[PDB]
From Swiss-Prot:
GO cellular component, one term: extracellular space
Record-annotated disulphide pairs: 6-127, 30-115, 64-80, 76-94
Name of the molecule in the record: Lysozyme C
Organism field: Gallus gallus (Chicken)
Gene name tied to this protein: LYZ
GO-annotated biological processes: cell wall macromolecule catabolic process; defense response to bacterium; defense response to Gram-negative bacterium; defense response to Gram-positive bacterium; killing of cells of another organism
Lineage: Eukaryota, Metazoa, Chordata, Craniata, Vertebrata
Length: 128
């Protein structure tokens, strides 16, 4: 599923992501735009052999199981495929664990280089 901007803000806000660990709702919609282009089915191979999955591109090195990343962890206890669903529940619960772990939203390289220090509230402007 490719989400519209307002539609993704209303789903993230219903799943409790708004000001989660102090990060406003515009930071999460901003990240999703530059990680996946709002597309739940997005995948990218990394050079160490791990893969990023879904609307927030969550890494198979630590967070989920794809059966092809040797001696990796599955700390969200999910298959990688669960993070490709039109239902973003799996992805949101998985991102709450990651952003709680010491480094905050710096875990997302596109957040760090394209959303940190900008007008992030612009990403939810106009939505009800
Ligand atoms: C709502 C309109 O913006 C729709 N829109 C009209 C055309 N726009 C004109 C403009 O954006 O003022 C120029 C192209 N646009 C550039 C950009 O968005 O920054 C990329 C495509 N957009 C993506 C989007 O906006 O979600 C969809 C089409
Ligand atoms: C031509 C305009 O599209 C200029 N536009 C500024 C105003 N936009 C326009 C809008 O989408 O209504 C609203 C804010 N916008 C939200 C979003 O688009 O997703 C993020 C910033 N954008 C990034 C981008 O386009 O990729 C900068 C370019
Ligand atoms: Cl915001
Ligand atoms: Cl594996
Ligand atoms: Cl923080
Ligand atoms: Gd824009
Ligand atoms: Na894994």
């Amino acid at each position: 599923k490719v989400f519209g901007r307002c539609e993704l803000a209303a789903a993230m806000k219903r799943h409790g992501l708004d000001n989660y660990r102090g990060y406003s709702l515009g930071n999460w919609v901003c990240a999703a735009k530059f990680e996946s282009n709002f597309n739940t089915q997005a995948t990218n191979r990394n050079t160490d052999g791990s893969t990023d999955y879904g609307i927030l591109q969550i890494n198979s090195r630590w967070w989920c199981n794809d059966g092809r990343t040797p001696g990796s962890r599955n700390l969200c206890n999910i298959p990688c495929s669960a993070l490709l669903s039109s239902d973003i529940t799996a992805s949101v619960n998985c991102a709450k664990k990651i952003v709680s772990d010491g480094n905050g939203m710096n875990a997302w390289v596109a957040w760090r280089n394209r959303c940190k220090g900008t007008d992030v509230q612009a990403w939810i402007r106009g939505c009800r």
